[PDB]
Design a protein around this ligand. Structure first.
Ligand SMILES: Cc1cc2nc3c(=O)[nH]c(=O)nc-3n(C[C@H](O)[C@H](O)[C@H](O)COP(=O)(O)O)c2cc1C
Ligand SMILES: Cc1cc2nc3c(=O)[nH]c(=O)nc-3n(C[C@H](O)[C@H](O)[C@H](O)COP(=O)(O)O)c2cc1C
Ligand SMILES: C=C(C)[C@H]1CC=C(C)C(=O)C1
Ligand SMILES: C=C(C)[C@H]1CC=C(C)C(=O)C1
Ligand SMILES: [Cl-]
Ligand SMILES: [Cl-]
Ligand SMILES: [Cl-]
Ligand SMILES: [Cl-]
Ligand SMILES: [Cl-]
Ligand SMILES: [Cl-]
Ligand SMILES: [Mg+2]
Ligand SMILES: [Mg+2]
Ligand code: NA
Ligand code: NA
Ligand code: NA
Ligand code: NA
Ligand code: NA
Ligand code: NA
Ligand code: NA
Ligand code: NA
Lengths: 399, 399
């Protein structure tokens, strides 16, 4: 069915429908697909779904000139810990990714691989089974009671990374980025948001290290910026973006309750702008909005009103993608896109609307999403959401 | 004469005319007099002007419930270097300050002493004459060619403060604050703006130290926060405010050209909010706006459009005073005061309009200021600017 209490607005008369260049890609509009984990990858081997993933991405690439950021992809086995999320370290994985990239490109759209390392969000019991560590910045604070329980049962203790192990992850980021580009991707996004490993280093709650990787703003940002620099050198600044969620609390990050949080993220933004003036400007910075501090709460919940991401614009002078509860708020998007370097990521409603871009342009009703199939091993709630045409044929306008 | 090309607007229907409590003071409106050096203090001894200073402040206290921040006052001889700016270290000084405070209080207004230390802005030749050092954070970067010339001639080299000398300044801040309160002031403002000594420590251009007072965000902020803590302990958090100018370039500060500048100031704001949650909230943070990056450029010049101070509001949750080109822009003030913890500092137009508050309320013409008498040793351009009533009697409406 369509979302019941929603008054659509056509956005075709706004900058959302003005072309913009991001890295090497000439986007034809500024509605971006942000990274969305769907858990259809197959075990063993963290292989992109051989039955459905091409179709899923093809559907969502249908509007020409759309920028798609993939679901997060593990850079290595040690970086993972969910059996049904994909990786980008193996030949068998890359064979499937290449088909996905080719399909997106045939629709004249673009694809950026999000590179992920889980840290304390990983399942310690899956990792123990595979003879892998359970990693984080520190070993004296733990994500939550369920993770604690899983770790006790699996007898797999949270492990504070050594400097050598940080370097090994950096090597893996580099190879994963190279694999992605060689397989046909337009670029990569470094995930430093949502409470995964890089965020665990940025955040003073999860990072209580006393070496050069913790204990100050500069030190907490070190790992993230090392990955940035390593990938810029490996594949080019124009093929690299960075994702941040300054106000996020998902996976036990501090958000606005930490009074130093703006400073921490302002520092990162400043260091990116320094590199940009020095000839190496990232393709984009991607921000999760305080509109959504936890993406598994229904739209309107988990809003933080005590802070804004606008500070980033005073510092970083490149493109900015913003995501978080924008689909149901065209009135907000209309204002935000007046800034000529702002793009809008639409997550949950791109799950449920393969033709979302057409619907945004024309002010059409939106398909409701089905949270029960966000992570299911099924084609249902993955590739069977209808376009607007299909929805009308199905009688959804009278449901 | 009145300002010729200005269309006044009455602001009496806005929050500018709603009462607010700042520290111990019940302000009746939110038009604040920011600190304005006038150079009428007498030499020797840096004594507030015995002929005119009481009258000057009395005039500008005339609207009941006005918050007045004094001209900057030196905490010690070593902190000074201008012969005609006042100090707050001596009995002879405090005798005059007490008369000033009493006069302001008789008008049912309030007075906060701004405490200053010049650093590299001081005149090296005056200091040499008095057997004093020429101080800054570092000794390998210098303010400008004129200061260099003065230092060479006076044979008084720029000196990088030792840690012991920083401690001595802190002792002096404490005694100056105590002197101010004991003499009758309602509070003090710590000047950490406009390129004076504390700002010279905050800014990475002027601070190239490799000890604990430089080389990182936390270290560059150390001196400012030490002064904050020392004064909070000495006279109470409710009697202390802090002034900052993140985007200022006056006295050779970096402003927005430094990509780390927002992070630096965001850190300070965060550390103030941390103290506030821990039971010691400063009375206010006072910000100079990027509207005015150098206060000796005519309104509209030296505007920096690449940055906003709005970031401070995401971090610091107390009152914020904002200053910079607001007198000629009532349309901007009308929007800014919709925020219920925002006050507006009016500098140059309070120099020229002793009854500025009445004029803001009622939308009256403003007296032009005379920059030639900003720093003159004269009553002219100090205590002879007319109220609106006096200006009409003088025929200014037909000039
Ligand atoms: C099912 C689901 C999966 C997600 N997967 C990822 C991910 O792999 N990487 C990431 O950075 N964010 C991920 N997110 C967060 C989204 O990219 C996005 O920021 C968030 O959903 C808010 O935007 P929205 O309100 O438009 O849905 C996910 C969100 C959802 C709901
Ligand atoms: C003549 C003059 C003297 C000033 N003296 C001081 C001072 O002692 N301390 C300070 O922090 N700022 C000082 N300032 C800066 C002002 O407080 C204020 O921030 C600035 O003039 C911008 O506001 P305006 O546009 O309303 O004049 C001075 C400015 C002027 C023009
Ligand atoms: C497993 C992952 C790759 C994603 C899970 C959900 C969110 C919000 C992420 O950021 C990462
Ligand atoms: C001599 C001083 C006390 C003031 C001089 C001018 C400005 C803008 C200040 O901030 C300080
Ligand atoms: Cl609904
Ligand atoms: Cl799993
Ligand atoms: Cl490449
Ligand atoms: Cl004029
Ligand atoms: Cl002088
Ligand atoms: Cl006291
Ligand atoms: Mg169902
Ligand atoms: Mg004259
Ligand atoms: Na259905
Ligand atoms: Na419409
Ligand atoms: Na099938
Ligand atoms: Na789950
Ligand atoms: Na005159
Ligand atoms: Na009016
Ligand atoms: Na006289
Ligand atoms: Na002068």
């Amino acid at each position: 069915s369509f979302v019941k209490d929603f008054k659509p607005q056509a956005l075709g008369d706004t900058n959302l429908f003005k072309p913009i260049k991001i890295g090497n890609n000439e986007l034809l509009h500024r509605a971006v697909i942000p990274p969305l984990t769907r858990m259809r990858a197959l075990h063993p081997g963290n292989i992109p779904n051989r039955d459905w993933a091409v179709e899923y991405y093809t559907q969502r690439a249908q509007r020409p000139g759309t920028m798609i950021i993939t679901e997060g992809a593990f850079i290595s086995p040690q970086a993972g810990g969910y059996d049904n999320a994909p990786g980008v370290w193996s030949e068998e994985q890359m064979v499937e990714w290449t088909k996905i990239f080719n399909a997106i490109h045939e629709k004249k759209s673009f694809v950026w691989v999000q590179l992920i390392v889980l840290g304390w969000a990983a399942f310690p019991d899956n990792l123990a089974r595979d003879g892998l560590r359970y990693d984080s910045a520190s070993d004296n604070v733990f994500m939550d009671a369920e993770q604690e329980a899983k770790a006790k049962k699996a007898n797999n203790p949270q492990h504070s990374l050594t400097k050598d192990e940080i370097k090994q992850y950096i090597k893996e980021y580099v190879q994963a980025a190279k694999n992605s580009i060689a397989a046909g991707a337009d670029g990569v996004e470094i995930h430093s948001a949502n409470g995964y490993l890089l965020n665990q280093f940025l955040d003073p709650h999860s990072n209580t290290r006393t070496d050069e990787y913790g204990g100050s703003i500069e030190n907490r940002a070190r790992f993230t910026l090392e990955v940035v620099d390593a990938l810029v050198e490996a594949i080019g600044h124009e093929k690299v973006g960075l994702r941040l969620s300054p106000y996020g609390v998902f996976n036990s990050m501090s958000g606005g309750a930490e009074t130093g949080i703006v400073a921490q993220y302002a520092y990162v933004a400043g260091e990116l702008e320094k590199r940009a003036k020095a000839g190496k400007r990232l393709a984009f910075v991607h921000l999760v909005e305080p509109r959504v501090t936890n993406p598994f709460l229904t739209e309107g919940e988990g809003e933080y009103e005590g802070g804004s991401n606008d500070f980033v614009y005073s510092i970083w002078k490149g493109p900015v993608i913003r995501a978080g509860n924008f689909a149901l708020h065209p009135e907000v998007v209309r204002e935000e896109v007046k800034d000529k370097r702002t793009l809008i990521g639409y997550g949950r409603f791109f799950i449920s609307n393969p033709d979302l871009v057409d619907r945004l342009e024309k002010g059409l009703p939106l398909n409701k999403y089905d949270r029960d199939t966000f992570y299911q091993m099924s084609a249902h709630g993955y590739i069977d959401y209808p376009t607007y045409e299909e929805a009308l044929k199905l009688g959804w306008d009278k449901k």
